[PDB]
Design a protein around this ligand. Sequence first.
Ligand SMILES: [Mg+2]
Ligand SMILES: [Mg+2]
Ligand SMILES: [Mg+2]
Ligand SMILES: [Mg+2]
Ligand SMILES: [Mg+2]
Ligand SMILES: [Mg+2]
Ligand SMILES: [Mg+2]
Ligand SMILES: [Mg+2]
Ligand SMILES: [Mg+2]
Ligand SMILES: [Mg+2]
Ligand SMILES: [Mg+2]
Ligand SMILES: [Mg+2]
Ligand SMILES: [Mg+2]
Ligand SMILES: [Mg+2]
Ligand SMILES: [Mg+2]
Ligand SMILES: [Mg+2]
Ligand SMILES: [Mg+2]
Ligand SMILES: [Mg+2]
Ligand SMILES: [Mg+2]
Ligand SMILES: [Mg+2]
Ligand SMILES: [Mg+2]
Ligand SMILES: [Mg+2]
Ligand SMILES: [Mg+2]
Ligand SMILES: [Mg+2]
Ligand SMILES: [Mg+2]
Ligand SMILES: [Mg+2]
Ligand SMILES: [Mg+2]
Ligand SMILES: [Mg+2]
Ligand SMILES: [Mg+2]
Ligand SMILES: [Mg+2]
Ligand SMILES: [Mg+2]
Ligand SMILES: [Mg+2]
Ligand SMILES: [Mg+2]
Ligand SMILES: [Mg+2]
Ligand SMILES: [Mg+2]
Ligand SMILES: [Mg+2]
Ligand SMILES: [Mg+2]
Ligand SMILES: [Mg+2]
Ligand SMILES: [Mg+2]
Ligand SMILES: [Mg+2]
Ligand SMILES: [Mg+2]
Ligand SMILES: [Mg+2]
Ligand SMILES: [Mg+2]
Ligand SMILES: [Mg+2]
Ligand SMILES: [Mg+2]
Ligand SMILES: [Mg+2]
Ligand SMILES: [Mg+2]
Ligand SMILES: [Mg+2]
Ligand SMILES: [Mg+2]
Ligand SMILES: [Mg+2]
Ligand SMILES: [Mg+2]
Ligand SMILES: [Mg+2]
Ligand SMILES: [Mg+2]
Ligand SMILES: [Mg+2]
Ligand SMILES: [Mg+2]
Ligand SMILES: [Mg+2]
Ligand SMILES: [Mg+2]
Ligand SMILES: [Mg+2]
Ligand SMILES: [Mg+2]
Ligand SMILES: [Mg+2]
Ligand SMILES: [Mg+2]
Ligand SMILES: [Mg+2]
Ligand SMILES: [Mg+2]
Lengths: 115, 177, 79, 66
Amino acid sequence: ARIAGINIPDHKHAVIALTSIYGVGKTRSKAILAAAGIAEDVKISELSEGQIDTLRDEVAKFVVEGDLRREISMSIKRLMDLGCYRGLRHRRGLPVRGQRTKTNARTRKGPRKPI
Amino acid sequence: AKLHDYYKDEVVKKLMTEFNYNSVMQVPRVEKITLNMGVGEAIADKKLLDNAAADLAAISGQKPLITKARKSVAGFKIRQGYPIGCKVTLRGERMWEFFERLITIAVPRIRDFRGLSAKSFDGRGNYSMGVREQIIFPEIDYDKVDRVRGLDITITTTAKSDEEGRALLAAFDFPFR
Amino acid sequence: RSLKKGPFIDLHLLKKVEKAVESGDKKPLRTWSRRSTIFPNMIGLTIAVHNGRQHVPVFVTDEMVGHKLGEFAPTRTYR
Amino acid sequence: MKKDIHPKYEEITASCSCGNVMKIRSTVGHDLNLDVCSKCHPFFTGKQRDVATGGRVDRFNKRFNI
RNA sequence: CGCGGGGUGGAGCAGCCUGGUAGCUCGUCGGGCUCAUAACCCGAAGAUCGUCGGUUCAAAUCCGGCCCCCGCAACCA
RNA sequence: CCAGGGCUACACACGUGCUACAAUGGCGCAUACAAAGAGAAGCGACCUCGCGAGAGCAAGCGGACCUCAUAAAGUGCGUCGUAGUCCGGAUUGGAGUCUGCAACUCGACUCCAUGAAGUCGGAAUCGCUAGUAAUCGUGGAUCAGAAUGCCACGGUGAAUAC
RNA sequence: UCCUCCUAAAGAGUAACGGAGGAGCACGAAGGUUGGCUAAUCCUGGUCGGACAUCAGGAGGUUAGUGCAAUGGCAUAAGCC
Ligand SMILES: [Mg+2]
Ligand SMILES: [Mg+2]
Ligand SMILES: [Mg+2]
Ligand SMILES: [Mg+2]
Ligand SMILES: [Mg+2]
Ligand SMILES: [Mg+2]
Ligand SMILES: [Mg+2]
Ligand SMILES: [Mg+2]
Ligand SMILES: [Mg+2]
Ligand SMILES: [Mg+2]
Ligand SMILES: [Mg+2]
Ligand SMILES: [Mg+2]
Ligand SMILES: [Mg+2]
Ligand SMILES: [Mg+2]
Ligand SMILES: [Mg+2]
Ligand SMILES: [Mg+2]
Ligand SMILES: [Mg+2]
Ligand SMILES: [Mg+2]
Ligand SMILES: [Mg+2]
Ligand SMILES: [Mg+2]
Ligand SMILES: [Mg+2]
Ligand SMILES: [Mg+2]
Ligand SMILES: [Mg+2]
Ligand SMILES: [Mg+2]
Ligand SMILES: [Mg+2]
Ligand SMILES: [Mg+2]
Ligand SMILES: [Mg+2]
Ligand SMILES: [Mg+2]
Ligand SMILES: [Mg+2]
Ligand SMILES: [Mg+2]
Ligand SMILES: [Mg+2]
Ligand SMILES: [Mg+2]
Ligand SMILES: [Mg+2]
Ligand SMILES: [Mg+2]
Ligand SMILES: [Mg+2]
Ligand SMILES: [Mg+2]
Ligand SMILES: [Mg+2]
Ligand SMILES: [Mg+2]
Ligand SMILES: [Mg+2]
Ligand SMILES: [Mg+2]
Ligand SMILES: [Mg+2]
Ligand SMILES: [Mg+2]
Ligand SMILES: [Mg+2]
Ligand SMILES: [Mg+2]
Ligand SMILES: [Mg+2]
Ligand SMILES: [Mg+2]
Ligand SMILES: [Mg+2]
Ligand SMILES: [Mg+2]
Ligand SMILES: [Mg+2]
Ligand SMILES: [Mg+2]
Ligand SMILES: [Mg+2]
Ligand SMILES: [Mg+2]
Ligand SMILES: [Mg+2]
Ligand SMILES: [Mg+2]
Ligand SMILES: [Mg+2]
Ligand SMILES: [Mg+2]
Ligand SMILES: [Mg+2]
Ligand SMILES: [Mg+2]
Ligand SMILES: [Mg+2]
Ligand SMILES: [Mg+2]
Ligand SMILES: [Mg+2]
Ligand SMILES: [Mg+2]
Ligand SMILES: [Mg+2]
């Protein structure tokens, strides 16, 4: 229970143990354990230390944690520099996927403000 | 222990050829590593200092000094002779032992690591690192601490410039940008 | 985004680019086609995209390729 | 050093998953297990793989191919 | 001119003469109830304390000037 | 008559919805049961590819026959053990799919990663008297494409009315 | 009433309803003595940490400090441990 950047769960199934890793979800974690040859029902508490080393090389194939965060930050920061419609939308702090901006949009825009 | 023997044999001889030094003593040597931990939040909770003291005492070999406040200021709400932070001024044998343990295993365990800053010098060869987490060192147990606290490492040398001082650390296979 | 079967540009714009590129760098191209994509050959041109009431000059760079022309022309003005 | 006041500064064996066995001295306890070290960490390759990510024109050419 | 006292959200008052985090009542603002307005009920913001300076680790609160306001004196020939 | 642009703007305020805030449950394989529709420049099997939207070749049917069409709740075996969680699924980045001359303003869906508020809601206040409320599917109309709306359909199925 | 400076004219003293400030204490360590120590304020680097908390080095050197107003004095330190 110390693979990738962080991953230190305990008393948790191996599939859901790797969801706590940034860049790995529910479906990707099943692909990790299938390739490693590990059962999904087991937990990291009951599993061997030499068998954790097999999980380290498998997650290294995919882009995860500090590699991914910056790859997202790069792509967002790229848009803003171009000065495109999405780039304006980002730095203004308003929704991008042609969403309604009148009633709702509170997730992106933030909580309520006075007038 | 080993890095001190490595320094005497391999590094000095490497550093003499770079800046054509006349004497062996002219080479910069690492004087002391000062591990500092300004806990600060000890104003509210007095034990929170003593928690940091144990973490520094775990990280380093020796027990830390509790540094007092040098002068009273209203911005932080602190008074004269109030315990605000912890410190360790380790040097000599345990210094070379800690310096190995820092660069060889701890520095790698930094989260979102890439390459340590080359510009980070004082204009007199004296380096400093700022580690965000305590967890990067393997001494601290994971289910013991309960605070995102860290320390700063401060490497003091006998160098007269940062250009001269960078080579010394660079000779130990130290990661720079 | 749409369309796998060849990235889309309007005939009149494709011709206008190909005629402008082979001749050389001259002036902004008055174009109403926002819908059209940007090719690699368009890099260097300062084509003027119709925002709604007027044409907005856009110097095409290395990054402005996969994106369409209408993205570089805000229609509704706010504050 | 002042005896008694300090914690027990004992010798221990670091053994990472890479293979690099390495004895050190620290206030841990019995044994150690590591993920990475000064060797085997991707900083020499990390910077090579990180810096060479950008490239927009070829990405367009990979779709159209004509 | 002399000796008291003041100057605090938009209004009137506490907290000010015992230095550390500014209340109360109305009013303004948002939502309710009502056919609508008021009343009523529920949330919300709003004052760096006359001003300019000192001392102080830190000043609405201590001390000094200046600027207004209010009271009392301004007498015997 | 025509090109684009706009009706999709956004310090805010309300209406009507939907999805939530979980363990009477969520995830997983696996099992049984509907009705009412609709189709002709249509609806389009089974095949073979697809991680999936879908892609080619084409079977039949102007239909009690052929197709969209496996209904989902519901069971039965697990596993999670009350966490902002395997709850929520917002939001952003990338990679795509069909329709269509054309998808950036301004579509729908898919995949991948991402994982916001929210832990049952102040004063108030709404509908409902039995196959009714509640909850889970499903269809149609307009419609190239574009429903959490509208209009229909049937599952399990209450409490209470002194 | 008591303390400090000027007025006070290079010893002391020296008035005015002349010019400015303080005191009516504090402390069993803030006394004794022994043995040590050196400051302000900046510069640059450094986790949260920012002008400023804590650390390192460099710069300045008594602008510091002296339980309390001002004066005279203190590194031999009367300063701080
Ligand atoms: Mg959407
Ligand atoms: Mg829309
Ligand atoms: Mg929409
Ligand atoms: Mg609100
Ligand atoms: Mg008079
Ligand atoms: Mg009202
Ligand atoms: Mg509110
Ligand atoms: Mg209030
Ligand atoms: Mg308030
Ligand atoms: Mg105050
Ligand atoms: Mg008389
Ligand atoms: Mg038109
Ligand atoms: Mg409309
Ligand atoms: Mg309304
Ligand atoms: Mg209303
Ligand atoms: Mg509302
Ligand atoms: Mg519930
Ligand atoms: Mg779920
Ligand atoms: Mg059936
Ligand atoms: Mg029928
Ligand atoms: Mg057809
Ligand atoms: Mg149809
Ligand atoms: Mg088909
Ligand atoms: Mg079809
Ligand atoms: Mg069939
Ligand atoms: Mg069949
Ligand atoms: Mg398949
Ligand atoms: Mg396949
Ligand atoms: Mg037949
Ligand atoms: Mg038949
Ligand atoms: Mg269907
Ligand atoms: Mg059937
Ligand atoms: Mg099937
Ligand atoms: Mg169960
Ligand atoms: Mg809960
Ligand atoms: Mg969360
Ligand atoms: Mg979650
Ligand atoms: Mg999830
Ligand atoms: Mg969405
Ligand atoms: Mg079709
Ligand atoms: Mg169709
Ligand atoms: Mg789906
Ligand atoms: Mg919350
Ligand atoms: Mg209830
Ligand atoms: Mg509920
Ligand atoms: Mg109502
Ligand atoms: Mg009735
Ligand atoms: Mg539902
Ligand atoms: Mg429906
Ligand atoms: Mg239909
Ligand atoms: Mg359809
Ligand atoms: Mg006398
Ligand atoms: Mg004199
Ligand atoms: Mg004389
Ligand atoms: Mg004299
Ligand atoms: Mg006299
Ligand atoms: Mg007096
Ligand atoms: Mg004394
Ligand atoms: Mg002495
Ligand atoms: Mg002085
Ligand atoms: Mg003095
Ligand atoms: Mg003496
Ligand atoms: Mg003394």
